[PDB]
Amino acid sequence: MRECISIHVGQAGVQIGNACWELYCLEHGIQPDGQMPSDKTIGGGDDSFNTFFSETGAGKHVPRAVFVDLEPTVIDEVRTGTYRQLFHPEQLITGKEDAANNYARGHYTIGKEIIDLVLDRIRKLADQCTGLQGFLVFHSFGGGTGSGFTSLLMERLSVDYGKKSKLEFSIYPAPQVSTAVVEPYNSILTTHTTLEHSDCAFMVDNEAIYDICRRNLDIERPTYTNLNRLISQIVSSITASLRFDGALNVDLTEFQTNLVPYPRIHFPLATYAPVISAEKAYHEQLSVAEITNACFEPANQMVKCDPRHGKYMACCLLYRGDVVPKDVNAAIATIKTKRSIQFVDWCPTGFKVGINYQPPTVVPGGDLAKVQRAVCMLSNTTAIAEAWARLDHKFDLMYAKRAFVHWYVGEGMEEGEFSEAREDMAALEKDYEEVGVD
Amino acid sequence: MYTFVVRDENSSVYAEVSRLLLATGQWKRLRKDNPRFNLMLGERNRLPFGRLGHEPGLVQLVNYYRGADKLCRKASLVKLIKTSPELSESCTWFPESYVIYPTDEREVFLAAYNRRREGREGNVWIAKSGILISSEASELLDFIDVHVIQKYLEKPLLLEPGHRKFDIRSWVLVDHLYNIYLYREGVLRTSSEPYNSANFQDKTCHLTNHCIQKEYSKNYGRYEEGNEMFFEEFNQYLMDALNTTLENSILLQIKHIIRSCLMCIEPAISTKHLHYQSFQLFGFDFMVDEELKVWLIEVNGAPACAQKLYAELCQGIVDVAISSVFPLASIFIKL
Amino acid sequence: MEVIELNKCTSGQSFEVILKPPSDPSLEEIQKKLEAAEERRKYQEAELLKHLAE
Amino acid sequence: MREIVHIQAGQCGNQIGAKFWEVISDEHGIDPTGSYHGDSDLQLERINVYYNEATGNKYVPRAILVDLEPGTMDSVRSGPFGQIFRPDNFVFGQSGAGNNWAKGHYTEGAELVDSVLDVVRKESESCDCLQGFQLTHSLGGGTGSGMGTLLISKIREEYPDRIMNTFSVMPSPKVSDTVVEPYNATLSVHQLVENTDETYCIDNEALYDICFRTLKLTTPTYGDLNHLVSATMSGVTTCLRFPGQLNADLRKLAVNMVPFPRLHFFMPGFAPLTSQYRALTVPELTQQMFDSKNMMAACDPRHGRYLTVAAIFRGRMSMKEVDEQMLNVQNKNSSYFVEWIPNNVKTAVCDIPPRGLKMSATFIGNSTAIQELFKRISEQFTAMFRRKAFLHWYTGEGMDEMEFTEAESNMNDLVSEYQQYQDA
Ligand SMILES: Nc1nc2c(ncn2[C@@H]2O[C@H](COP(=O)(O)OP(=O)(O)OP(=O)(O)O)[C@@H](O)[C@H]2O)c(=O)[nH]1
Ligand SMILES: Nc1ncnc2c1ncn2[C@@H]1O[C@H](COP(=O)(O)OP(=O)(O)CP(=O)(O)O)[C@@H](O)[C@H]1O
Ligand SMILES: Nc1nc2c(ncn2[C@@H]2O[C@H](COP(=O)(O)OP(=O)(O)O)[C@@H](O)[C@H]2O)c(=O)[nH]1
Ligand SMILES: [Ca+2]
Ligand SMILES: [Mg+2]
Ligand SMILES: [Mg+2]
Ligand SMILES: [Mg+2]
């Protein structure tokens, strides 16, 4: 068994972390108490769930996680929330003044003052690990803390933990729920600085989740609560292999091995199905073929883009529930004859498949209905570069007029970092086109 | 009040389309950089499809299908037909074609060439991408130095009087629901010079495109205005000369070829469940031989129109492709 | 269409199906960056206080 | 707990400041005695932003009342919520400023400014994490304009990393007390351009026209004008006073609203205009809040473009319909929004409506059309300054003509800077 430490940065990172750990406790049968009436080895063990949970002598199962935010009100809700008994106070780190949606403020000004504290708190969790394999970092692109402090943290983690893997769960900015005009700036600034420090990053576009909630959950005006509970289901599907007995993606290293052939191109597209409303009085359970076919619909992807006009480098299918290999292969065979799927020449046209017999766990009183089978597809397609193109274009529009730039310069950041970050993104787009377009 | 943008000022068809939209008083033209549009009349090259359908509160439509270039480039069209099981090698309405890169199908080319070399068959081939028609294969490869070498139809249907060859242009509109609309009006681009089966250097009687005829033919405009014969006259000719109609002898095959090509590429380019919608106007070019058999020669992704037919066709585009998505306050045959 | 490396447990199973074969900055450097930005803030503030002093 | 320190200076500043504290105390359920008597925890969750807590659960406004004469502050103390203010926070002189910027800024105000800063310091030292200051004042008088901008400069000196925000009442010949108002305003604008982060431009010309044309008030008083101001101030500070995601603090607001440091002068709006029993639909709130007749700066927004816009809807309503209508007005008039700042319109929704209304909407716009306001002041300034008219009132206080020339040039610079981005 090798432990994984989760790090939640900023409002988005923290609130998503809240939803995830709540779901984890439900999946593993852990009460808000922290007690786990199925773990017969009291006060320790090396089971698969021990990757995410440590154990006290009193039988409390504590998340190997750190919550960091430069403003206390969000984490204060964790301190007084349902799972307050779950976390140790030392795991919850709060500042007094946030980064004001300013990358430079979160990275340079405030980041410099709190980075040693956070690393020390992370160090304490690492000391409890017999064989730490790496970190899972949750944050937004658009926030000052989520963008600025994360990139500094990722830089320092590479220094203090050079051999460890680092995976990201990043929230891509969407105007329908965005809170800042400068989020394109922050997104590109943090991508440029973090790019060489992340082994694998799962981007989630708020626009996609928002529309999925409206379309499939019949929610007129989705809140962060609605969004995060859906995201947590996808995150759970991805990390399930680290927490349960299995043979696919059993460690963080295998994520890079299976999904990321080219280091810089480490942004796999996630697609989830089925998403069914709990308010739906009558629903017909979808088959293996139906939910697998849904994995190739843009409406079900975490980032709206068109994989038909790109190329695949790798594809992983993660099933949960009543699923057997025979039905998967039969589904794949039919899909291959009806859909436009193109792998790059230097990669095999195939799928790595993982099945966990336990159907997805839903939050009692949540928006999601119980299904007998679900699937999350992780595919490294060049089509996800459409998201970079959108982001870079908004960057170019504002930066050409140097709009809002003075806010970043005023925090001690040099203006050259803007163009430096943008050039790196331009190179990234060019890499995708080289791999994906003939 | 709907909004649109124009990003191709050199397009004749959509310059008229944009004019009609404004004339309704219910469409507003925005700056070409304004992202808050309902309709995009996009550019021919590197259209930013990746930035479409990401504007909250806006239904967005574009006048081009992403991926339609596979059908509208000579090199890719050949590869599409030969590798698509819906079209396959057993495609009887597309001439024998091979993709030849400059300095590949060179080996299969010469092999099927030798089938005609010492087999006593017409071994005249045409090179396309600047066009050379030759019976010598070695001469073709000399000129090529991406190209495609296609079997030249040595026995075309010749119009009388004049012993004139021609090509048929059909305009096809595919809407956002992937309905295939064939414009009932087509046009024949005719060669005003007699057909010579020995003088291939004289390409003014072998190449039927309008520009060449206007430049090198002294008989330009003799038989019809601008070497353009329309369907009413051509149908009457087929009745008088060959005792048949345009619908039976030719249009049936044309409808078949159009559907076959577009239905083949449908799952790759359809915007059925996409976050933005697409339509596109296509220009199909056909050849007709002596046996009244129709051959497809190419597909144009950004076609112009006949001057006489601009008004009707462009209004039809507004009606079935634009207003169908954005209702205001048939000239097409549905295939 | 070949199925390879099938592994089975009581929790589930995994496998791979193939349709077609193929055809840095140090701790010190980070500190330099943070301190360089800090002195730039100090300089800009010093200029402000000088301007207000006048 | 991110505290704001409130300061009100001069006659106008204290009159509108008092009404501001009357309105929001009612919204937060605070009585004139400082006791809470509301029925919602939403009223108290962020009440520490503007209020200090006292033993016995008394809530005291973090407000400082400044004037160079005791007159208006005597009326405030004798007013409705006069008792709610901390007695020590009443700082006043006896001389007055005689509607003279020089007296407020250089002579009379110079003698009193230190005692004000002593109170400012005492309030800031009690703050868990002070986020910044808000000042209410007029630009046309002497104390609010002259001593007000003096205070701002002194405050920036002691608190350089804190946000400075102002509610600045712009003078108008329609509602004028003295002919030297353009002089005082121009001198003040010069200061505001350099030393504030956010300035709400409240035009007395607009306030009068709204009372006249819309509210059907035949003879508008300053009391009628201040009713519009207090309602506007309540709406613009709503996101600061109640739980929310958008512009929840002064700095995040500035980052969203100010693309260029000098262009931070906002055109406020409010709907419905009240001096009525049927409630406005969400479409109606949206149309009116963007209407020129609901603007407070007397500038035609169609004569310019919006750099950034903040919108705040209050009351129980469909957030879906709010999103639809806000997207509608943007997509319908996209030309009036700069295209080089994508998604520059932000919308917030608070559940608690203002007093007497079930639904309301507050508009905050950074429009280039605000140059019409400064152009207006500039013309009135030059008309007198070309003949050096009424200058002796200022040179008698030690000022030189050069300082007037510099102030005039810098405001004309500000005007051309707006024109620059209006054409961009
Ligand atoms: N899906 C999701 N997105 C969120 C959530 N909270 C914020 N966001 C998004 O994150 C961006 C704002 O960043 P935040 O995480 O709020 O900022 P922060 O990291 O707290 O940094 P500062 O507050 O600027 O110090 C916006 O694009 C929001 O849409 C959440 O709970 N769920
Ligand atoms: N295999 C073949 N047999 C006989 N004639 C042929 C031929 N291929 C091409 N041609 C003739 O050559 C002419 C031009 O061919 P091609 O379609 O390559 O040029 P083009 O694409 O520029 C015309 P457009 O673009 O206007 O549709 C056609 O009008 C046709 O008559
Ligand atoms: N809206 C409003 N404007 C006022 C009020 N009192 C004065 N003014 C305006 O403010 C200017 C006079 O400044 P004043 O505040 O009286 O001077 P001070 O006391 O020296 O700051 C003139 O332009 C007046 O029109 C008021 O109560 N409300
Ligand atoms: Ca155990
Ligand atoms: Mg935050
Ligand atoms: Mg062509
Ligand atoms: Mg007065």
DSSP letters along A341-357, please? --B-TTS-EEEEEEEES
The minimal CB distance from D341 to the residues A100, A181, A220 is found for A181
Handedness of CA D186, D187, D191, D197 (dihedral sign): negative
In single-letter form, the type of residue at position C17 comes to: V
What separation in Å is there between the alpha carbon of D33 and the centre of ligand 7? 29
Non-local (6+) Cβ contacts of A287 within 8 A are A327, A373
CB pairs under 8 A between C and D: 9
B1-63 under CATH 3.40.50.11480, yes or no = yes
Which residue from A264, A305, A271, A235 is spatially nearest to A379, judged by alpha carbons?
A: A271
The answer, yes or no, to whether any atom of ligand 1 lies below 6 A from the CB of A148, is: no
- Measured CA to CA in angstroms, residue D368 lies from A183, A271, D267, D348 at distances of 23, 44, 10, 23
Inter-chain touch C16–A353, beta carbons under 8 Å? yes
Which residues of chain A have a CB within 8 Å of the CB of C36? 412
Where are the domains positioned within chain D?
A: 1-259, 260-369, 370-424
* Contact in structure between B18 and B10 (CB atoms under 8 Å): no
Which phi and psi angles does D195 have, rounded to 5°?
Answer: -120, 10
Inter-chain touch A389–B51, beta carbons under 8 Å? yes
Which chains contact D through at least 3 pairs of Cβ atoms less than 8 Å apart? A, B, C
User: Which residue from A minimizes the CA distance to B56?
Assistant: A176
Beta bridge partners of A339: none
* Contact in structure between A10 and A149 (CB atoms under 8 Å): yes
Which residue from D277, D242, D265 is spatially nearest to D358, judged by alpha carbons?
A: D277
**DSSP string covering A184-240:** HHHHHHHHHHHTTT-SEEEEEEHHHHHHHHHHHS--SS--HHHHHHHHHHHHHHHHH
Strand boundaries in B140-227, DSSP class E = 147-151, 166-174, 180-183, 187-190
The answer, yes or no, to whether any atom of ligand 2 lies below 6 A from the CB of B213, is: no
Mutate to test the interface with B, among D326, D334, D344, D346 (most CBs of B within 10 A): D334
Separation CA B188–CA B169 (nearest Å): 6
Q: What is the CATH number of domain D260-369?
A: 3.30.1330.20
Fold of B96-154: Dna Ligase; domain 1 (3.30.1490)
* Cα-based angle D254, D258, D261 (whole degrees, multiple of 5): 105
* Contact in structure between A170 and A201 (CB atoms under 8 Å): yes
Give the CA-trace dihedral at B216, B220, B223, B224, to 10 degrees.
130
What separation in Å is there between the alpha carbon of A157 and the centre of ligand 4? 29
CATH class of D1-259: alpha beta
SS3 B88: coil
What separation in Å is there between the alpha carbon of B300 and the centre of ligand 6? 6
Which residue from A236, A222, A142 is spatially nearest to A190, judged by alpha carbons?
A: A142
In single-letter form, the type of residue at position B98 comes to: Y
Separation CA A302–CA A170 (nearest Å): 11
SS3 C13: strand
**DSSP string covering A234-277:** HHHHHHHHHHSS-SSS-SHHHHHHHH-SSTT---PEEEEE---B
Which residues of chain D have a CB within 8 Å of the CB of B1? 332
Give the CA-trace dihedral at A330, A332, A334, A338, to 10 degrees.
180
Separation CA B324–CA B175 (nearest Å): 9
Which residues of chain D have a CB within 8 Å of the CB of C50? none
The answer, yes or no, to whether any atom of ligand 1 lies below 6 A from the CB of A256, is: no
Q: Whose CA is nearest to atom 21 of ligand 2?
A: B298
In single-letter form, the type of residue at position A62 comes to: V
Can you tell me which residue has the tokens 């701002």?
D152
Which residues keep their CB under 5 angstroms from ion ligand 4? Answer: A 39, 41, 45
* Cα-based angle D360, D362, D365 (whole degrees, multiple of 5): 160
SS3 B293: coil
What separation in Å is there between the alpha carbon of A55 and the centre of ligand 4? 7
User: Helices D371-385 and D401-423 sit at what angle, rounded to 10 degrees?
Assistant: 150
Please state the atom number of ligand 1 nearest to the C-alpha of residue A69: 20
Separation CA A17–CA A235 (nearest Å): 10
Asked if B211 has any chain D CB less than 8 Å from its own CB, the reply is no
Separation CA A233–CA A410 (nearest Å): 40
Q: Which CATH number fits domain A384-438: 1.10.730.10, 3.90.550.10, 1.10.10.60, 1.10.287.600?
A: 1.10.287.600
User: Helices B106-117 and B137-144 sit at what angle, rounded to 10 degrees?
Assistant: 150
User: Which residue from D minimizes the CA distance to A224?
Assistant: D245
Which residue from D238, D187, D303, D323 is spatially nearest to D46, judged by alpha carbons?
A: D238
Q: Whose CA is nearest to atom 16 of ligand 1?
A: A11
* Contact in structure between D368 and D262 (CB atoms under 8 Å): no
SS3 A31: coil
- Tally the residues of chain B: 335
The minimal CB distance from A401 to the residues D256, D319, D424 is found for D424
Q: Whose CA is nearest to atom 5 of ligand 3?
A: D12
Asked if C29 has any chain A CB less than 8 Å from its own CB, the reply is no
Buried b / exposed e across D237-273, counting CB within 10 Å, b at 16+? bbbbbbebbbbbbbbbbbbbbbbbeebbbbbbbbbbb
Which chains contact C through at least 3 pairs of Cβ atoms less than 8 Å apart? A, D
Where are the domains positioned within chain B?
A: 1-63, 64-95+155-335, 96-154
Which of B167, B197, B202, B214 has most ligand 2 atoms within 8 Å of its beta carbon, as the pocket-test mutant?
B167
Separation CA D76–CA D63 (nearest Å): 13
Can you tell me which residue has the tokens 């003295």?
D178
* Cα-based angle A68, A71, A75 (whole degrees, multiple of 5): 55
* Contact in structure between C38 and A412 (CB atoms under 8 Å): yes
Indicate the helix (H) or strand (E) that contains D53: strand D51-54
User: Which residue from B minimizes the CA distance to D338?
Assistant: B34
> Whose atoms come closest to the Cα of B171: which ligand?
2
Residue D149: half-sphere exposure toward Cβ, Cα within 13 Å:
28
Can you tell me which residue has the tokens 């077609």?
C20
A19 Cα distance to chain centroid: 12
Which phi and psi angles does D386 have, rounded to 5°?
Answer: -60, -25
Q: Which two tokens stand for residue A59?
A: 């039988």
Inter-chain touch A112–C15, beta carbons under 8 Å? no
The answer, yes or no, to whether any atom of ligand 1 lies below 6 A from the CB of A10, is: yes
Which residues of chain A have a CB within 8 Å of the CB of D421? 401
Which residue from A83, A65, A67 is spatially nearest to A75, judged by alpha carbons?
A: A67
Asked if B144 has any chain D CB less than 8 Å from its own CB, the reply is no
User: Which residue from D minimizes the CA distance to A95?
Assistant: D129
**DSSP string covering D284-325:** HHHHHHTSGGGBSS---GGGS-EEEEEEEEESS--HHHHHHH
The answer, yes or no, to whether any atom of ligand 2 lies below 6 A from the CB of B150, is: yes
The answer, yes or no, to whether any atom of ligand 2 lies below 6 A from the CB of B298, is: yes
Query: Which sequence positions of A are flagged as catalytic?
Result: 254
User: Any idea what DSSP says for residue B320?
Assistant: I
CB pairs under 8 A between A and C: 105
Asked if B56 has any chain A CB less than 8 Å from its own CB, the reply is yes
How many Cβ atoms are within 10 Å of B206's Cβ, its own excluded? 22
Fold of A1-268: Rossmann fold (3.40.50)
Q: Which two tokens stand for residue B234?
A: 């051509």
Mutate to test the interface with C, among A248, A326, A408 (most CBs of C within 10 A): A248
Which residues of chain A have a CB within 8 Å of the CB of B53? 304
Non-local (6+) Cβ contacts of A243 within 8 A are A24, A27, A28, A48, A49, A51, A52
Handedness of CA A375, A377, A383, A388 (dihedral sign): positive
Judged by 3 or more CB pairs under 8 A, whether C touches A is: yes
**DSSP string covering D122-148:** HHHTT-SS--EEEEEEESSSSIIIIIH
Which residue from A91, A130, A95, A128 is spatially nearest to A110, judged by alpha carbons?
A: A95
The answer, yes or no, to whether any atom of ligand 1 lies below 6 A from the CB of A295, is: no
* Contact in structure between D101 and D381 (CB atoms under 8 Å): no
What separation in Å is there between the alpha carbon of B246 and the centre of ligand 6? 25
Alpha helices in D210-297 (DSSP H): 222-236, 238-241, 250-257, 282-289
Architecture of the domain made up of B64-95+155-335: 2-Layer Sandwich (3.30)
Inter-chain touch D323–B56, beta carbons under 8 Å? yes
Same fold, B64-95+155-335 and B96-154: no
> Whose atoms come closest to the Cα of A225: which ligand?
1
Inter-chain touch C12–A357, beta carbons under 8 Å? yes
Please state the atom number of ligand 2 nearest to the C-alpha of residue B298: 17
> Whose atoms come closest to the Cα of D176: which ligand?
3
Q: Which two tokens stand for residue A93?
A: 């780190």
Please state the atom number of ligand 2 nearest to the C-alpha of residue B125: 1
Architecture of the domain made up of D370-424: Orthogonal Bundle (1.10)
Inter-chain touch A101–D256, beta carbons under 8 Å? yes
Inter-chain touch C49–D153, beta carbons under 8 Å? no
Judged by 3 or more CB pairs under 8 A, whether B touches C is: no
The answer, yes or no, to whether any atom of ligand 3 lies below 6 A from the CB of D220, is: no
Q: Is A102 known to sit in a ligand binding site?
A: no
Separation CA D19–CA D136 (nearest Å): 11
Closest approach of D288 to chain B, Cα-based (Å): 20
Architecture of the domain made up of A269-383: 2-Layer Sandwich (3.30)
Q: Is A228 known to sit in a ligand binding site?
A: yes
How many Cβ atoms are within 10 Å of D413's Cβ, its own excluded? 12
Which residues of chain B have a CB within 8 Å of the CB of D332? 1
* Contact in structure between D201 and D297 (CB atoms under 8 Å): yes
Beta bridge partners of B230: B187
